[PDB]
Amino acid sequence: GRVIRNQRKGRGSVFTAHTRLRKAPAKFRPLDYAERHGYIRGIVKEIIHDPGRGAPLARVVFRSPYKYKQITETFIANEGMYTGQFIYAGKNAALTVGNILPLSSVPEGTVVSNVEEKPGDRGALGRTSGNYVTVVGHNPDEGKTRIKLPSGAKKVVPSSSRGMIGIVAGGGRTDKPLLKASRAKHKFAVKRNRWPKTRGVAMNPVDHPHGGGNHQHIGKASTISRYAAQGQKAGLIAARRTGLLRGTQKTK
RNA sequence: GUGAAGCCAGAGGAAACUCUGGUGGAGGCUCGCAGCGGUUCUGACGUGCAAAUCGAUCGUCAAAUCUGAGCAUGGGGGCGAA
RNA sequence: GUCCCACCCAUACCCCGCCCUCAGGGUAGAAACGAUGCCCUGAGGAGUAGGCGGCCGUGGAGGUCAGUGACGAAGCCUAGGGCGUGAGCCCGGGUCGAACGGCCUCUAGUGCAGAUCUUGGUGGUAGUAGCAAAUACUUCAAUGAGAACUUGAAGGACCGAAGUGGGGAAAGGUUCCAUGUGAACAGCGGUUGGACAUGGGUUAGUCGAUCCUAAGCCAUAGGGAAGUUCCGUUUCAAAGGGGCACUCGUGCCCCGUGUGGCGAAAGGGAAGCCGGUUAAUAUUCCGGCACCUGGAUGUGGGUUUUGCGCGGCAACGCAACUGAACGCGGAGACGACGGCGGGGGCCCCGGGCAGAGUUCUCUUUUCUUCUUAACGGUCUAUCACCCUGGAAACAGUUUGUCUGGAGAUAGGGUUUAAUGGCCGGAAGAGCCCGACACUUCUGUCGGGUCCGGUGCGCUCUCGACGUCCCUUGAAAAUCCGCGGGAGGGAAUAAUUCUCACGCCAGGUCGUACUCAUAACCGCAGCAGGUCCCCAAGGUGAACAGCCUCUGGUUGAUAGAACAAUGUAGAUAAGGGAAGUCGGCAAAAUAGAUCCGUAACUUCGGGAAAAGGAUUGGCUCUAAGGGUUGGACAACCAACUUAGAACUGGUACGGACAGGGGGAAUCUGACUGUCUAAUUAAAACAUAGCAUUGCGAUGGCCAGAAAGUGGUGUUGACGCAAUGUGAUUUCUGCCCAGUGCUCUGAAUGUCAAAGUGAAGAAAUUCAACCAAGCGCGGGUAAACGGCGGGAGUAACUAUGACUCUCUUAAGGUAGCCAAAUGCCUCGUCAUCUAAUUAGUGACGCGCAUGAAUGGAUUAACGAGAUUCCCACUGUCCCUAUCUACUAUCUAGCGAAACCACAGCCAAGGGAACGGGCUUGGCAAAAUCAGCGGGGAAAGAAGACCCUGUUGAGCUUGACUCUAGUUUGACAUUGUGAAAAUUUUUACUUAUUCAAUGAAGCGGGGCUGGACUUGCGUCCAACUUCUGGAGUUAAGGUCCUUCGCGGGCCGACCCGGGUUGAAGACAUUGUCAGGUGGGGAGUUUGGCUGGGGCGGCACAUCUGUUAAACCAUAACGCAGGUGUCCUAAGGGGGGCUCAUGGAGAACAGAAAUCUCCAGUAGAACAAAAGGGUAAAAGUCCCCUUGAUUUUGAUUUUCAGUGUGAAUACAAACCAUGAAAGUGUGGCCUAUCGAUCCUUUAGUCCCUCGAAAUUUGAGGCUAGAGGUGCCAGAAAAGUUACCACAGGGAUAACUGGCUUGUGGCGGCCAAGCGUUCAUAGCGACGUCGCUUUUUGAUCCUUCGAUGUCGGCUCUUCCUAUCAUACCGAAGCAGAAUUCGGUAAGCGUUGGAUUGUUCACCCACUAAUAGGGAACGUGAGCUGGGUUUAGACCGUCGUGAGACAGGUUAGUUUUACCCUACUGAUGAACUCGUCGCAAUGGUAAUUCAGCUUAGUACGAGAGGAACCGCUGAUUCAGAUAAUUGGU
Ligand SMILES: [Mg+2]
Ligand SMILES: [Mg+2]
Ligand SMILES: [Mg+2]
Ligand SMILES: [Mg+2]
Ligand SMILES: [Mg+2]
Ligand SMILES: [Mg+2]
Ligand SMILES: [Mg+2]
Ligand SMILES: [Mg+2]
Ligand SMILES: [Mg+2]
Ligand SMILES: [Mg+2]
Ligand SMILES: [Mg+2]
Ligand SMILES: [Mg+2]
Ligand SMILES: [Mg+2]
Ligand SMILES: [Mg+2]
Ligand SMILES: [Mg+2]
Ligand SMILES: [Mg+2]
Ligand SMILES: [Mg+2]
Ligand SMILES: [Mg+2]
Ligand SMILES: [Mg+2]
Ligand SMILES: [Mg+2]
Ligand SMILES: [Mg+2]
Ligand SMILES: [Mg+2]
Ligand SMILES: [Mg+2]
Ligand SMILES: [Mg+2]
Ligand SMILES: [Mg+2]
Ligand SMILES: [Mg+2]
Ligand SMILES: [Mg+2]
Ligand SMILES: [Mg+2]
Ligand SMILES: [Mg+2]
Ligand SMILES: [Mg+2]
Ligand SMILES: [Mg+2]
Ligand SMILES: [Mg+2]
Ligand SMILES: [Mg+2]
Ligand SMILES: [Mg+2]
Ligand SMILES: [Mg+2]
Ligand SMILES: [Mg+2]
Ligand SMILES: [Mg+2]
Ligand SMILES: [Mg+2]
Ligand SMILES: [Mg+2]
Ligand SMILES: [Mg+2]
Ligand SMILES: [Mg+2]
Ligand SMILES: [Mg+2]
Ligand SMILES: [Mg+2]
Ligand SMILES: [Mg+2]
Ligand SMILES: [Mg+2]
Ligand SMILES: [Mg+2]
Ligand SMILES: [Mg+2]
Ligand SMILES: [Mg+2]
Ligand SMILES: [Mg+2]
Ligand SMILES: [Mg+2]
Ligand SMILES: [Mg+2]
Ligand SMILES: [Mg+2]
Ligand SMILES: [Mg+2]
Ligand SMILES: [Mg+2]
Ligand SMILES: [Mg+2]
Ligand SMILES: [Mg+2]
Ligand SMILES: [Mg+2]
Ligand SMILES: [Mg+2]
Ligand SMILES: [Mg+2]
Ligand SMILES: [Mg+2]
Ligand SMILES: [Mg+2]
Ligand SMILES: [Mg+2]
Ligand SMILES: [Mg+2]
Ligand SMILES: [Mg+2]
Ligand SMILES: [Mg+2]
Ligand SMILES: [Mg+2]
Ligand SMILES: [Mg+2]
Ligand SMILES: [Mg+2]
Ligand SMILES: [Mg+2]
Ligand SMILES: [Mg+2]
Ligand SMILES: [Mg+2]
Ligand SMILES: [Mg+2]
Ligand SMILES: [Mg+2]
Ligand SMILES: [Mg+2]
Ligand SMILES: [Mg+2]
Ligand SMILES: [Mg+2]
Ligand SMILES: [Mg+2]
Ligand SMILES: [Mg+2]
Ligand SMILES: [Mg+2]
Ligand SMILES: [Mg+2]
Ligand SMILES: [Mg+2]
Ligand SMILES: [Mg+2]
Ligand SMILES: [Mg+2]
Ligand SMILES: [Mg+2]
Ligand SMILES: [Mg+2]
Ligand SMILES: [Mg+2]
Ligand SMILES: [Mg+2]
Ligand SMILES: [Mg+2]
Ligand SMILES: [Mg+2]
Ligand SMILES: [Mg+2]
Ligand SMILES: [Mg+2]
Ligand SMILES: [Mg+2]
Ligand SMILES: [Mg+2]
Ligand SMILES: [Mg+2]
Ligand SMILES: [Mg+2]
Ligand SMILES: [Mg+2]
Ligand SMILES: [Mg+2]
Ligand SMILES: [Mg+2]
Ligand SMILES: [Mg+2]
Ligand SMILES: [Mg+2]
Ligand SMILES: [Mg+2]
Ligand SMILES: [Mg+2]
Ligand SMILES: [Mg+2]
Ligand SMILES: [Mg+2]
Ligand SMILES: [Mg+2]
Ligand SMILES: [Mg+2]
Ligand SMILES: [Mg+2]
Ligand SMILES: [Mg+2]
Ligand SMILES: [Mg+2]
Ligand SMILES: [Mg+2]
Ligand SMILES: [Mg+2]
Ligand SMILES: [Mg+2]
Ligand SMILES: [Mg+2]
Ligand SMILES: [Mg+2]
Ligand SMILES: [Mg+2]
Ligand SMILES: [Mg+2]
Ligand SMILES: [Mg+2]
Ligand SMILES: [Mg+2]
Ligand SMILES: [Mg+2]
Ligand SMILES: [Mg+2]
Ligand SMILES: [Mg+2]
Ligand SMILES: [Mg+2]
Ligand SMILES: [Mg+2]
Ligand SMILES: [Mg+2]
Ligand SMILES: [Mg+2]
Ligand SMILES: [Mg+2]
Ligand SMILES: [Mg+2]
Ligand SMILES: [Mg+2]
Ligand SMILES: [Mg+2]
Ligand SMILES: [Mg+2]
């Protein structure tokens, strides 16, 4: 048989993400002395649209504590942020929307965005439009913080991890139907070469495990073991259950 | 060609929102020329003009439209709206 | 039919000659002899495969012939000889020119008709096919040997601004220009040429490259890799650039986070325009007039002298008008589309000027020219911004919008923005006229070169608005501004000047030409393909079609004629789909304006639904604008609309251009995409829906590895993997099976490592185990599944209901003879005259059914289907016209194919002959057609089978494997605690993350707030504002007294950059599991083709089997893979099955008695033999079913194996013995090598020598190969491949004729009566090859496989027609039969049909053959490769003799045959004859006979005669119609 499309995707080549129109990655400031001990003030210059990203980004200018230059950063814009707004990043920053604070100096029950998995990593969690991370609780003796992720998972991160107060802008982007093949094409044409998608059962046996046959049918259980070989993992990988979800799920 | 929002005016009514002239210029809308394609004649030709062309008739024609150059993917590999 | 006589001839027989072979003899005191010779005698002679012998020929070697030869070697040619059976040898003649041969040995690349053989050459075909797309040529002249395709002039035409025009990019490379030209090429010619030959031609600071970066590529540091090299592109790197100072280069002082290259002739980007000029270059040359960049220093100007301009309220202005580091900003720099406004150019209109055209007539006419570059100066030009002021009675305002107390209207200003006006350039140019010189050298000189208008016009550009996006639409080099304020700046002298003028320089490569019906790629001068720019007039909505201007061509082999058949363009009376699988093809409709427009609907559509009317020309009228005066008048300007009269051909979108429509069904929602070159679809995609995994120490994936990579400039509204497939309404039940997921205990299973025991040790044995699995839960929008039987309602049918068997559950809602149902052309209704079609219903549905999605569905569809209107040559039924061919000619000129060839009939034959046999026959040489034959040409059949030949794909095939999971060992160190194992502590190994490696850890100074034995905790100064923040101010001492030098300002200390994980993870090596993701391989045989079946595959009995033996078939009836401690061995006593008599229960049968009883019983098992004091049966004793090795028999090769037979060595059993016993009374009951396991002994070996373990040998058994002389082995292919096979299937033919069809003989019986008018049982004899079987003879290096259409001929077993005979024949109508194939045998609905059945006509609507006639005749509806859907089946790939949809139909010019047409020879003609060949007519109706014969009556013929008509044939065009 052939190498299947899912296997080919990992080679790169035509499946590499598009990057020309992306200006800079969305990252916090590097964790420095000012952010560790007090706060630093930055000015929002513009709210820009980043192709391939649903959420808008905010360009924020800060002063260098050690040089005469000025530094422009690219944050994920939280909804409610505006051009000409002062934002504050640090331990002693006020608890207002757009401020970047360590989770230790944040009370329980507030939502943040671009939460660092570890301090200094400049943001990893809850960075997509309409998404946020909730600060469930604190453990000061352990120096840790329990948070709730957009997926519903519970995580524990060091209290020094930073986050931006508020909710990622971009609202309910997925609330309107795409309604058109062209609109799906435009959505993915700035992300990746993954659209359109041909069904495996419409292929031939040389091309996919779902293969051919005189009727379009999978012919064997579509749930595939977690430890199946590469080239076998087509369908529902390591599926605990299948079928329509007809009630609440114990797992979360 | 059709004529979506938005806008102007006038008629009713009590209200609220009904109606009627206009304006406007949206749509993977439509007729249709070039381009692109290739349905039927199962036409021509079938030691051809041609190792796939020719004619008529057809599909689409403002956007999943057509196309140049540069560049990338190399054989059990690639690429594939398959 | 029989008998007799003579005769004819085979390669046979007889006699003779000769050849050869074989056989038998003779031949030496050698006068003897290729002694391998000779002489004598007898017999014999076929031959594929094959064997042997002898000889001939070729290249080369040794010896020899004292060989041949320029007075002619070799070779070659030869209707000239000789020899040999023959292969061959020799000679004569000719040609020719330098070597060669005989004999004996030696040697080999040694002998050709084949191999779809190799290379080369050459034929018939054949002067043949053909040289026919792109509208088209003609006259005169010149040139020349020669002119349709050279040139000039004239005419006629085309391209018709998305050109046949003018220039470019790629690509070519000299094709560009001049001159000359024999051949070759330009498929005709050629004087011509992109050809050939000889010479020329490409000029840049300004146009490009060069410079920049993009996607991307390659280095570097490092890390992998055995390595070629891979990653890496800033990453675990000590990676650079700025200034000052001496006689002299070298003395220092500051900044630093960066620290490569390549990559665009369309992206970014410094700068050039006009006129002229050459044969060919020009934005490059020449003339004039400019610009940019860089470098230098001047003159003037400006500014200042303790300093770096002035003005304006302001927006800002002015000719400058200092400014380091460091920083900020702008430009470069960006999407698509819409309407509006400005500008350039083009187009158009009016007037004037100059020229030209027309001018019978008319036309103040028609056409052309009338131009102004870069670069500058100057004045303007929307948006915006500034000042005054303060708006509701809101106002301003666009086509649209919008704007305003965050300050509108208004008034006044500032400013970005020329492709605008004027001026310089610049009229001196260019152009246009006009007039005077002249072999040329020289032209010369005059004049003129203007003014207005218009616009939904075209094109480009600019501007302000606006729309769309889950889409927001490059980078860098370079240039500029500013914030900052470092340095520096002569009251009589320079002046860190972006001002004016001035000086110097600008290298290198490209530059011709074409860019295409001839310069590129398609083998080529190819109707194909190949990226752009400019873009006139008319009609018209219009870069539509059609015509024209500029410009370009007139180039595609020509002449003549007008047959068939064609290709292309059309027209047809009447009918109007009757054609056909099917309306294929064609026709019909078509623009605009005005009316009118249904069902349904997602309310958007449907819709141009359906349909109807009008349209020309001319003469008028009205309306729709701008400007000025004074509510009218005047002036200016286009078009768009409406109304009226008149008028003609009742015509007018007059050409061109240009929708047919409707009622429904299946299906996919739609737009979109694909099998380039047979499938455009219902397939794919899609939005929507649903499921699954993943929180980064991660999911999925790539890599040999990596300090590797993609997703990822990413973080659940995300990434990845699947299914279904818009909307609407729904999506039922089943977790038993296979998967996936979760737990691994009360539970079982296990490897390596480790633990314990035994041992001398190797080892062996025990426990223990991680993963995985057994186990137990979950899960179907996972793969998938979703049942049988029996009764039941006052007649009855059915079964609401019930009784019963089983599953994991038993098909729910829906839907249906549907693209899914076989039976089936289902049943009913409708549609038609007629419907296997369509639609609507019905449903025990072979085999419908719910995201393997069910049902419905507006809109959409080059999808499939039915009907209706319109329309028509599809047809009845054909006809006609045009162009180009074909045709004939000149020139040029192939190919396929070809054993030899070409008339038939029958026969036989390899079962379909051109050749053979027997007949018919049979006359040169030819031309146009033609599609019967050549089982015509393609192409070593693709269907089928075989091969111990493959390949693609699948899986629970066999064997493995990347990856992965888990365990162990190592990396791997240091502590503590718990009674060796577990837990948690350390950081330095190791791993991760961040950063420009800035503020980490301890303190102590201060600020605080909390507390009473004054003690502890916290903190380090930024949060009103879209400003700024840098090159330190100061304190303190030193000082050269300086924005100078140190310590503070800015606390000290540890040099751990910071934060995490941490001896875990990672990594290396082994071990268990998982692993169609991947690899390799396999997937029996026989066989009335193969498959399925069966086993005729090892083996036994009887028979087939034809009396020894032997002997076949998928022949017949059967049997075997066991069973027995006795059912083996010995001995003895007895006699069985059965019958007749008898005896209580007792009988048909229980036991007892007697008599008969040849085996009719029994002997393990099939069958056949055999057995009676036994071989049966019972009793007694036993283990001969033992040890050893030979011999023999059957199957047979006289090999194994299995069986079997007689005897020897022994020592046993039994009988008093004799004797018997080496398994089963006989004929079947079974198994090699290798390996393993036993048994056997003072047995042999472990090879330096010993002992003990262990191992290996020798002899005899066992573990098994049943495909049984003995491989370890699953499918599929419709995507398929190869070597073959007519050894072997599907279609023709051949034999046969069961079966099918058609007859005969007999005649029980039927027929009221009567077997035989006519039927006809039981039986029996046949014929036919239009059925289907059976066979496998021909064809698998191919004979084109159904049907229909068309066309001819043949048969008779006669449907009709002619003439006859019989009846249960009064007439009429029928029935049966005879002679009879002359002549006919139809039009339609449904179906691909064949077949069939209906409607209807008819005299009748008979049956058949001709390779199941007929595909180089058609067509392609059926069968039907590859695409696709459904149902059932399969785990799957896939299958289906099931349904459905789409799917390339090639070649004739040869020979013959046929149809026609010429024709030599016999002088040429005219008029004739007639051998032979062909042959043609057919049926019905009406009137009369006649309401008559005959009949009770109903009813109801016929002969003759008359008049028409059907089908067919041969002509013809007066008339009518078509063209
Ligand atoms: Mg592969
Ligand atoms: Mg798909
Ligand atoms: Mg497919
Ligand atoms: Mg597969
Ligand atoms: Mg699978
Ligand atoms: Mg499907
Ligand atoms: Mg469209
Ligand atoms: Mg085309
Ligand atoms: Mg064709
Ligand atoms: Mg036509
Ligand atoms: Mg012989
Ligand atoms: Mg030789
Ligand atoms: Mg000679
Ligand atoms: Mg010589
Ligand atoms: Mg040879
Ligand atoms: Mg030869
Ligand atoms: Mg031969
Ligand atoms: Mg010819
Ligand atoms: Mg031709
Ligand atoms: Mg011609
Ligand atoms: Mg032509
Ligand atoms: Mg002459
Ligand atoms: Mg010509
Ligand atoms: Mg023309
Ligand atoms: Mg154009
Ligand atoms: Mg040209
Ligand atoms: Mg051109
Ligand atoms: Mg190129
Ligand atoms: Mg010449
Ligand atoms: Mg020629
Ligand atoms: Mg010539
Ligand atoms: Mg010539
Ligand atoms: Mg000449
Ligand atoms: Mg340039
Ligand atoms: Mg350069
Ligand atoms: Mg590299
Ligand atoms: Mg290295
Ligand atoms: Mg470069
Ligand atoms: Mg450029
Ligand atoms: Mg010059
Ligand atoms: Mg001065
Ligand atoms: Mg650009
Ligand atoms: Mg015009
Ligand atoms: Mg001028
Ligand atoms: Mg001037
Ligand atoms: Mg003048
Ligand atoms: Mg072309
Ligand atoms: Mg026009
Ligand atoms: Mg017009
Ligand atoms: Mg030309
Ligand atoms: Mg030609
Ligand atoms: Mg007609
Ligand atoms: Mg007519
Ligand atoms: Mg009609
Ligand atoms: Mg048609
Ligand atoms: Mg038509
Ligand atoms: Mg409507
Ligand atoms: Mg309709
Ligand atoms: Mg209409
Ligand atoms: Mg049309
Ligand atoms: Mg579709
Ligand atoms: Mg595509
Ligand atoms: Mg195709
Ligand atoms: Mg193909
Ligand atoms: Mg699913
Ligand atoms: Mg299950
Ligand atoms: Mg279960
Ligand atoms: Mg376990
Ligand atoms: Mg049901
Ligand atoms: Mg349906
Ligand atoms: Mg049904
Ligand atoms: Mg039906
Ligand atoms: Mg029907
Ligand atoms: Mg079913
Ligand atoms: Mg089903
Ligand atoms: Mg379901
Ligand atoms: Mg519909
Ligand atoms: Mg011909
Ligand atoms: Mg000729
Ligand atoms: Mg010959
Ligand atoms: Mg014959
Ligand atoms: Mg014959
Ligand atoms: Mg022959
Ligand atoms: Mg002849
Ligand atoms: Mg022909
Ligand atoms: Mg023929
Ligand atoms: Mg032949
Ligand atoms: Mg073959
Ligand atoms: Mg074999
Ligand atoms: Mg194979
Ligand atoms: Mg293959
Ligand atoms: Mg104090
Ligand atoms: Mg730690
Ligand atoms: Mg470890
Ligand atoms: Mg596998
Ligand atoms: Mg495999
Ligand atoms: Mg076989
Ligand atoms: Mg079988
Ligand atoms: Mg015998
Ligand atoms: Mg048998
Ligand atoms: Mg016995
Ligand atoms: Mg015994
Ligand atoms: Mg006895
Ligand atoms: Mg004894
Ligand atoms: Mg054995
Ligand atoms: Mg063995
Ligand atoms: Mg030894
Ligand atoms: Mg064995
Ligand atoms: Mg055998
Ligand atoms: Mg045969
Ligand atoms: Mg018969
Ligand atoms: Mg009879
Ligand atoms: Mg037969
Ligand atoms: Mg046969
Ligand atoms: Mg064959
Ligand atoms: Mg043949
Ligand atoms: Mg043939
Ligand atoms: Mg027919
Ligand atoms: Mg007869
Ligand atoms: Mg008769
Ligand atoms: Mg006849
Ligand atoms: Mg026949
Ligand atoms: Mg036939
Ligand atoms: Mg034929
Ligand atoms: Mg054919
Ligand atoms: Mg046929
Ligand atoms: Mg089928
Ligand atoms: Mg079909
Ligand atoms: Mg088709
Ligand atoms: Mg009478």
Side-chain angles (χ1 to χ4, degrees), chain A residues 53-70:
Chain A
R53 191 193 305 264
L57 303 180
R59 293 182 183 174
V60 188
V61 176
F62 293 80
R63 276 175 61 237
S64 179
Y66 320 94
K67 183 178 179 180
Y68 179 48
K69 77 177 170 254
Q70 90 183 3

Side-chain angles (χ1 to χ4, degrees), chain A residues 82-94:
Chain A
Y82 59 92
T83 49
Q85 176 184 357
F86 289 144
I87 66 164
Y88 305 80
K91 186 170 72 71
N92 294 339

Side-chain angles (χ1 to χ4, degrees), chain A residues 138-200:
Chain A
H138 302 272
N139 197 315
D141 297 338
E142 197 65 43
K144 308 201 145 314
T145 291
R146 289 180 314 290
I147 62 181
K148 181 162 164 269
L149 301 184
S151 68
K154 301 317 221 275
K155 210 188 199 298
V156 169
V157 296
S159 303
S160 192
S161 285
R162 297 175 293 168
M164 183 190 268
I165 305 292
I167 300 177
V168 177
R173 173 170 41 78
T174 61
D175 280 7
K176 88 185 296 193
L178 285 166
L179 204 77
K180 274 165 67 175
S182 79
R183 281 181 182 164
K185 183 181 195 287
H186 279 292
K187 176 182 183 182
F188 293 117
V190 289
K191 294 170 163 282
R192 274 168 313 281
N193 190 200
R194 72 172 298 285
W195 191 96
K197 184 172 278 196
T198 307
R199 290 169 295 111

